[PDB]
């Protein structure tokens, strides 16, 4: 198939992979820090999603340095992935418009 589409899928596969690794890593990094909440995988997975999407509920967040580092990676992957999709939609829309304009 085309490139931007292939790249979108790629973005989705990677995003899922980063969310999962994200949950594991968050817990590994947060446990040991008194007062931390990002300490069980299920919720850490849900924290990941919140973060990637930037919906930021504020019910869970890292408090340790590696936790925040992990957090940054998740945020960027989320932002990049969703942004790469937006570009994919633009390219598709630009190409068709070229056709519909007999160009």
């Amino acid at each position: 198939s085309a490139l931007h589409w292939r790249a979108a899928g790629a973005a989705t596969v990677l995003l899922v992979i980063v969310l999962l690794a994200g949950s594991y890593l968050a817990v590994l990094a947060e446990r040991g820090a008194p007062g931390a909440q990002l300490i069980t995988y299920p919720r850490a997975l849900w924290w990941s999603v919140e973060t990637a999407t930037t919906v930021g509920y504020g019910d869970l967040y890292p408090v340790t340095l590696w936790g925040r580092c992990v957090a940054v990676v998740v945020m960027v992957a989320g932002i990049t992935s969703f942004g790469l999709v937006t570009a994919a939609l633009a390219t598709w829309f630009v190409g068709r418009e070229q056709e519909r304009r007999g160009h």
Binding site: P34, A36, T40
Partner: peptide, 12 residues
Amino acid sequence: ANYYCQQSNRWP
């Protein structure tokens, strides 16, 4: 017997 509660909300 003996009963006990345990929380997993915050470390530890």
